[PDB]
Amino acid sequence: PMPPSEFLDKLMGKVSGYDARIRPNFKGPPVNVTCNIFINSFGSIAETTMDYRVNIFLRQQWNDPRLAYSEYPDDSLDLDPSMLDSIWKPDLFFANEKGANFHEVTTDNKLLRISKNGNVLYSIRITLVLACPMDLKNFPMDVQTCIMQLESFGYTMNDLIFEWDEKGAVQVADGLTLPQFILKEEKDLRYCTKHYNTGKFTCIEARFHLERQMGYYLIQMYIPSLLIVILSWVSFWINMDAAPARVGLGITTVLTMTTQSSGSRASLPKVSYVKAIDIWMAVCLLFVFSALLEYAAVNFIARQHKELLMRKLFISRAKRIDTVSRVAFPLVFLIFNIFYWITYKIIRSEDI
Amino acid sequence: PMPPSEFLDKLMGKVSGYDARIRPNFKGPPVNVTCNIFINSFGSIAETTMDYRVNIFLRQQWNDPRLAYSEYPDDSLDLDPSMLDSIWKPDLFFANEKGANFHEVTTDNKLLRISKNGNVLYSIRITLVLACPMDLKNFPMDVQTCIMQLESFGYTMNDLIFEWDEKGAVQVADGLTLPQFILKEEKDLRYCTKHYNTGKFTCIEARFHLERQMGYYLIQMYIPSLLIVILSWVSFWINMDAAPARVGLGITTVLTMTTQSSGSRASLPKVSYVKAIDIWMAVCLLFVFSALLEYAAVNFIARQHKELLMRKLFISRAKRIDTVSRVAFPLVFLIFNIFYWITYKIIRSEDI
Amino acid sequence: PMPPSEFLDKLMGKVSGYDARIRPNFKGPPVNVTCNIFINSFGSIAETTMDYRVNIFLRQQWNDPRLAYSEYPDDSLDLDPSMLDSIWKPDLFFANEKGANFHEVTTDNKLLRISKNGNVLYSIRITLVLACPMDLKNFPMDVQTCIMQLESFGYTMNDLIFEWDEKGAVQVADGLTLPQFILKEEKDLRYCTKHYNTGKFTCIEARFHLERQMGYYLIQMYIPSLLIVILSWVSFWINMDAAPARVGLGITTVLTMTTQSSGSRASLPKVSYVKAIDIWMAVCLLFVFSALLEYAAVNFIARQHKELLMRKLFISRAKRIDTVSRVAFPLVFLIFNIFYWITYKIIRSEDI
Amino acid sequence: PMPPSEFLDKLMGKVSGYDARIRPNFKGPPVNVTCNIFINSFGSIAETTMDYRVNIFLRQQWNDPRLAYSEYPDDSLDLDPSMLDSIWKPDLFFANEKGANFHEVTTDNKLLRISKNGNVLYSIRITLVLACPMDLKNFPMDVQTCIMQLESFGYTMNDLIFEWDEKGAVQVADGLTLPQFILKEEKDLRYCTKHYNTGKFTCIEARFHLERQMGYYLIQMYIPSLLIVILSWVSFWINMDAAPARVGLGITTVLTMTTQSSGSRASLPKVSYVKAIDIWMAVCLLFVFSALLEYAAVNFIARQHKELLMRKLFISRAKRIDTVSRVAFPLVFLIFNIFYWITYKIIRSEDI
Amino acid sequence: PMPPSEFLDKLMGKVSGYDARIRPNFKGPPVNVTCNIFINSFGSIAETTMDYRVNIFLRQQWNDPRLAYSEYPDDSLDLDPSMLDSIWKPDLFFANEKGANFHEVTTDNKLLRISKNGNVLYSIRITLVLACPMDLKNFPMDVQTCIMQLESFGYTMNDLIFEWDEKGAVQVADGLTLPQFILKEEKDLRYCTKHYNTGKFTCIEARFHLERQMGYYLIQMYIPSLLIVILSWVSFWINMDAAPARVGLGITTVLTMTTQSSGSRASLPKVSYVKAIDIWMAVCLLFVFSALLEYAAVNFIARQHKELLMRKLFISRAKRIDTVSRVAFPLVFLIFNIFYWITYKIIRSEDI
Ligand SMILES: C=C(C)[C@@H]1[C@H]2OC(=O)[C@@H]1[C@]1(O)C[C@H]3O[C@]34C(=O)O[C@H]2[C@]14C
């Protein structure tokens, strides 16, 4: 019967009165646009610059009174991806976006559909680097919230309003996991608005939730720091007759603790406030230091006993310091370590 | 006789009724497309971000009822690379793709052929960075699987279906080797499918297999860690009369072991679970530590003997600890090292 | 009534006598252009290369005698973003600009408006990397000034003059903070001019003010350096009977101080003059060194007493050095540390 | 007389029967193309990723029966660089190419010439990053071979064959030197061929030769490693009366040797086989270790003599070990160092 | 009177006989082009890859017999930046150029002027990364010469010749300074020529002069190395009675000197020849080593005296070595340090 290319030229082109530079249903209530977001591949989240790489598909549907053929026997039509200028897709930008170039492999990576009523389907895979203002109040637990702000640019609130969907809000790629964080399935979403000096613009957003999968942090720094503290404890028992060995153990244990505390913040961005690591390393450096101090006091009692040679009293005092020291370090460390964990587990359960 | 450019304009252009925006054999069974993949140069695999750089050639053949001249005396025709829009090549994208720009040196790097029946040949060299979800369950052996997902975008299962080839599936560049891994020639391949909220899309894949060429890992960390353990063993024999020297050997051996264990995970991505290196380094740090501990006990027996001066008994006990220690360390290390290797060689042979 | 696309073609196109390649009100006084700057997202400031990444919106208004319809009942019209060549927007470039590519997500990210009189509205989100000549006279306080130079290129002072606005000068994105610096709200602004060998060109600028949010610097280097100094002080009290231990403490404390002083300048760019850190580290390395020196003198008095065995006098002198040393170090350190802070707090209050 | 632009339009355009999409002398023997390569600037060779940056000029000449005016009085004509599509330059790609974008400063950086017979001249400066499979069998000498593979894409052996030149093959930029390697002037060249599954394609290549300019390697690692070995030798002579000092010298010399051996492979790519550095560092670490071992044996003889107090015999044995040790280390090191150099100098002279 | 756009279309377009693809004054003496260079912002000079980033403005003037209106009452006309193809600007490329993309902020960043006679003005801000072959014969002083080679591509010496200017040669941005180097105002300039295998091409150049602003280098490495040497000197005076302490001081001072000498060449590119730093560090490592050696000899005299117990003679010899050592080190260091500075200050004054 009729040719498909003849019908495609009759629908969009010189036969069509619309030039596509005018918004559909002009001088009428703004046409809402439904946006479904599918995450092709989450990951590559940069912690030192507070950003993340994600490619979404951005399928958007709107209705127009134009482009209603109502003469083909099927429900929808799969259009070419070379007719993108005739559709007049709406404007959309991200307000926290870095880079975000398009994709091009053998064609434009775009989808196009059109039904009898005018409901269209237009999805585009775009790799988006987005800046997120993560709050690193506690570095190991580190509940983070990542956002994406779907915003228009040039069409006001009384001209173009975006909206979400009701059958599914944000889908995710099947069988995708992240080593750094586990993606929460809550997918809390809502929408704000913008008030600039030129008008009222719509701003639709979506909030993600990322918690740290603990394990790596413990092996990398919690386990070495612990062993280092343990080494200091053994020093008292390791050396009794000769003092030098204890001195040098305590010196280099403090130096390697400061080296590890300096090396732990290399991947971290520069921030003013104090994290949990910056409490843990400081208190373990306090313990190792304090032990060395205790040692200085023991050598002072020994030097007083040497310059005196009350001999029994001095020996007794030294022995007492030695036997009280070693008993005291585990209880003051165990109570603190357990206390720290409880004071962070209960704030984790209060946050979650 | 007839001019070639006149025939080329008669075949594609104003004389041709097709505009090339319509799929061939429209309102008919989907035209399958045969895909042959040739790897120009594998390599540059990034371990810290789980990706790899590869340039394939992507020769794809399909048949159309149009573009059948049946008037030239030869079988096929070599077309210009400026007539790419007239062919209407099918859409194809990769679902795990980062970047992947085109190549441009003096022309478009594209091939074009057309036969009397309509079987075309279209290959394109594209440098593709693809993200692979490698599982680093054992870091030194590390059997990995890399995939490439040939997928359409805009044409459903009842509109366009891709397929593989039967005379050769994935070819590889002659005389190409990789320092990091040796490419398996098994080339296991199959194809999945996709079910989105818009329709059923085809997804053709191909699985590669990469195992680590062992050697470098052994020289870099297995040999230094071993020597370090050996150094600790010699300490007992190195120093008998004077205790300090043993103390300081054990301290710095533990500190350099923790330094090497911290420096070994710099190229590694942050991951929660425990690798074979994280067992080996932990057990060797246990051995070196344990030796230092044993030493603390020896100095405690020596200090008890000093504060007593049962003298013979104390000397005998110290001698016993010294002679049992040194006998015990090799057997408990050799049995463990051999055990570890057997428990990883048999899981390597069970995986392969 | 009349069609909107017919009116849009009548206003700009073949019906319009202007080709848009001629400046509005040609052979007349230069048309001034009002520029409002909104900072979408400040941050990612590079300290080692003296630059910063910022995306502004750059809304610019000018009046033209052309494009005055005076026939529609509304005040303004929202034009398409495909008619950008018909407006003839003015030239604008930044004189300290690196890179600064455009943005492209589904359309041109541009705004276009036109009123009855001719006052237009044109804003463009452009991610601008700008080079700022920061003066690092004092590294921890580090009051910096960042500038952006709005400059024309091709239109002289008697041809095109830019100007600022009176209802708001530079706006900023609501709820945006920077970890490195806190943005001052003073927003001091003025404008310079340029005199090249081709003519007089306008150059409009805006000055920002960035001070360091102190805290991170103190934890990272001030607290470790302090502890190191404290360790040296304890050495005198730690060891009295045996000299070696003090020697080795002082050696490695000097070596780790030089290591920390070398590692502190890794993020810093290479600069000739002396910062506050380069005074602090040098004076603390002086203190630790001086202590070791004092120690050398004590061992010289001890060796003189040994080669003599005036015995009482030598013992008294050694004791005196030991008791004067330890009293002297805190007062000469506390007076200096307080002095340094006062001499930098008062220059901070004099700068602010 | 006649206008030049009129003649340029008559030669190429609507008057010309060729559309330029057809190969010259179609249905005739393939037109060979002469390729002269000039290296504008060699350098920036990456060792960790096995690639190098080079910009060649790629002047290519071919003859066509068309475009023969034979009416101007001069020999050749210098055409515009905007008429590149009318010439129909042949296809050319590199089979080991990464990136390789074009250059653009104020025009297309292209040359165009045409003579009366039809011999054209077309050169293009293109910065080419090319991957070379260097074999690092011996790291310090390291004779490497870099290749460039000029290959067609779309025109078979019976359609288009490339060839080299006879008056000069590959020229090089005057007064250009490389710090890493000295470019050999031999410039050995030949050509292979390709056999794919679609046809026979020509592949013309050129081989370069790069040897390491020795010196830097010697200062950076050979001289420090030597000094370290020397330090170990002095230890025996440095300490005789007291054993600790020797113990600690040997410990830290082994630790700094392992640190230097770990730090030497940072710029190196990960490779399985053993280089000359990995023999040198291993044998010097063996020497330093062995010395420490010898020392353990001396302390065992000393402890046996202590637990005995045959006294003369034990003292004599210790003295003998001390005097045999120090005599033995230089001869066993000098013979080995000279042997290593001879066994690498003669394989260098056999390779060259 | 007459319209400006009508005159602009009459001057360039269909009324003009020239197509702009032909050089002005064809079959006549080559039109020279005057080039004035203004440096917008020098800086970001990379030392490890021998390059630098600079954006010049490149204002070029040439005369043509065409485009002479001689009918407007003014001297010059400010043309649009959309008519760049009608002017036929000459070709220009840089022979040592990497990257160098164009700038694009709201328009083309180009200037265009035309007078009654035909003298045009065309400037373009282009950020140019240029490779300079710096000779690092002496690393701290380091007089460097940076060049820019203005060269044509496609027009021979008898077709197009570039030239410099007489009223100003290379201008620089007012109030611009560089932390690394101070720009010399001599601005020595001349021009070479090129002789390829296709013809004689013009090549105009300009030489800059960059010397290091000394200060940073001294603080970073000269001051730490000095202190380290000083520490070694104090060792002799620090320890007299006990030998171990001196041994360990000398060991770790040699180890930290080798660490600092290894860490000093990290920013440096790999080069074969010997710099001033590689003499200074080697001679200071010689001094520290030599001191340790001297010490070995002292302990040998002490061990000979111990195995003898000529007693007075041995004590006297040891005392003599101790008192000659300490006197000798400053004079042999001061004479050398002063000598080195004089031998580099006089070669600096001979170079300048
Ligand atoms: C951390 C260092 C470098 C110290 C230094 O002085 C010490 O106390 C540490 C010790 O580890 C430990 C010891 O042997 C070392 C030595 O001789 O000095 C050094 C060695 C290496």
Residue numbers in the entry:
A (entry chain D), B (entry chain C), C (entry chain E), D (entry chain B), E (entry chain A): 31 to 339, 399 to 441
Give passages from the manuscript.
Glycine receptors (GlyRs), along with γ-aminobutyric acid receptors (GABAARs), are the principal determinants of fast inhibitory synaptic neurotransmission in the central nervous system (CNS). GlyR and GABAAR belong to the superfamily of pentameric ligand-gated ion channels (pLGICs). GlyR has a conserved pLGIC architecture consisting of an extracellular domain (ECD), a transmembrane domain (TMD), and an intracellular domain (ICD). The ECD houses the neurotransmitter binding pocket and the TMD governs the machinery for selective ion permeation.
In the GlyR–Gly/PTX reconstruction, in addition to the glycine density at the neurotransmitter binding pocket, an additional density was seen in the pore at the mid-level of M2 nestled between Gly2′ and Leu9′. This density was not observed in the other two conditions and likely corresponds to a PTX molecule. The hydrophobic isoprenyl end of PTX is oriented toward the Leu9′ and the hydrophilic end closer to the Thr6′. In the GlyR–Gly/PTX structure, the M2 helices are oriented outward with the Leu9′ rotated away from the central axis. The pore radius profile (created with the PTX ligand removed from the pore) shows an expanded ion permeation pathway at each of the constriction points seen in GlyR–Apo. In the GlyR–Gly/PTX, there are no residues below the line and the score is 0.0. Therefore, it appears that PTX exerts an allosteric effect on the intracellular gate Pro-2′ and prevents it from closing in the presence of glycine. In contrast, 173 chloride ion permeation events (defined as ions passing from end to end of the TMD of the intact receptor used in the simulation) were observed over the course of 1 μs (= 5 × 200 ns) of total simulation trajectory of the GlyR–Gly/PTX structure. This corresponds to an estimated single-channel conductance of ~20 pS (corrected to the value at 0.15 M NaCl) for chloride. Overall, based on the pore-profile features of GlyR–Gly/PTX and GlyR–Gly which show that there are no additional effects of PTX binding besides changes at the P-2’ position, and the MD simulations, which confirm that the pore conformation of GlyR–Gly/PTX has close to the expected selectivity and single-channel conductance, we believe that this structure may be close to the physiological open conformation.
